[PDB]
Design a protein around this ligand. Sequence first.
Ligand SMILES: [Cl-]
Ligand SMILES: [Cl-]
Ligand SMILES: [Cl-]
Lengths: 121, 120, 97, 97
Amino acid sequence: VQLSRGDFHSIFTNKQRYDNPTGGVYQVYNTNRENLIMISDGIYHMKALLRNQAASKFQSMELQRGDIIRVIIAEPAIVRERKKYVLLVDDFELVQSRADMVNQTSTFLDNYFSEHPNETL
Amino acid sequence: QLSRGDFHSIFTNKQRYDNPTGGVYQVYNTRNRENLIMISDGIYHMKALLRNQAASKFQSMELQRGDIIRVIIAEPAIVRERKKYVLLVDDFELVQSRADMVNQTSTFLDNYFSEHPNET
Amino acid sequence: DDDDILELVNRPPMSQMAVPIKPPESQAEQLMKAKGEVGVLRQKLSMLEKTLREHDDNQKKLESSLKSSHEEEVTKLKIELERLEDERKFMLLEQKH
Amino acid sequence: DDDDILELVNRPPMSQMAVPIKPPESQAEQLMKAKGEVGVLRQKLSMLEKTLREHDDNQKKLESSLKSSHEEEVTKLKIELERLEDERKFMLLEQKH
Ligand SMILES: [Cl-]
Ligand SMILES: [Cl-]
Ligand SMILES: [Cl-]
């Protein structure tokens, strides 16, 4: 199984990708506000807000750091006067349970875009 | 403390048969089948069928051997080929929980009446 | 072996103070029954709305047929009246001396 | 913190495939809700039966009032017919008598 390397950057810079940010393969990076998680594309790590079916599935399956998911329904969202990036995940599928971390020294997406602010749509 | 020999009075005395209430008895043995228990008067032990509020109360309270009760609503009954005596208990009150057995060598009432059948 | 005694559980009590208590049901049994009742009541309601609507459509249809049957009878009699009115006018017009 | 992010939980989704799922409820929470629904549906059904019965009683009442009024009108016309029959009858009797 391979993660969609650098896809979080593509979601906010490529229009076709922003319009439909689905099909991405991500690793859970870190785990009320229990539905707000950290996900990893192998290069960048960003916040993901689980909603609807995803929020139910993630909680019942007790998904945690290292599990690999494929996003099926998602919306991109930028908040706090364009400072904060979030992927709203409405549906996903479990790809692999408790896999080894592909990267532990990944870059926080919001930190990248604060340094490169012109790249976003 | 128990109504000593009352089970015998219930089936031999008409006034007692007509209204077999107020008796103080000790639970002798436990376990709808669960609602059929063995009760003791200190001399005799007989079967008791708990019905209505008494069936609910006994089950929720988890009454067992050694407990002392006072029968409030009851009906006498002699059922299969007269070898079967039962007290239908519709209501009772808890007198004492897990008291020591007043008698362990008591006589089964049906066994007594099989030997003395002329008095019923 | 005590089936003949257990048969007396439901025999009507002589005391009016003796009250039947429904056998305890677990939350799971009660939730299933409630959910099942919800489905049954929803079916009954959907059916009864259809019935009310049909009865209403039928009331309207039967009233229309009634009014139309009446108007036919009233027309027949009015036509009969005009005929007798014309007869009398024919009699006045021709002069049977 | 991330309150501005968490605020998006309830923002209507772009996808019609995105379905809200109520956070898990215990059997006790569900039993209360279900019992409440049962009561509401039973009230709605009891009320709808009353309505059907009333509509039925009204159909019967309105038809009876209709038949009564029509019969009054038919009687009025029949009375006028007999009057004209008698008039003609007298005119003929005069024409010979
Ligand atoms: Cl009972
Ligand atoms: Cl539960
Ligand atoms: Cl007249």
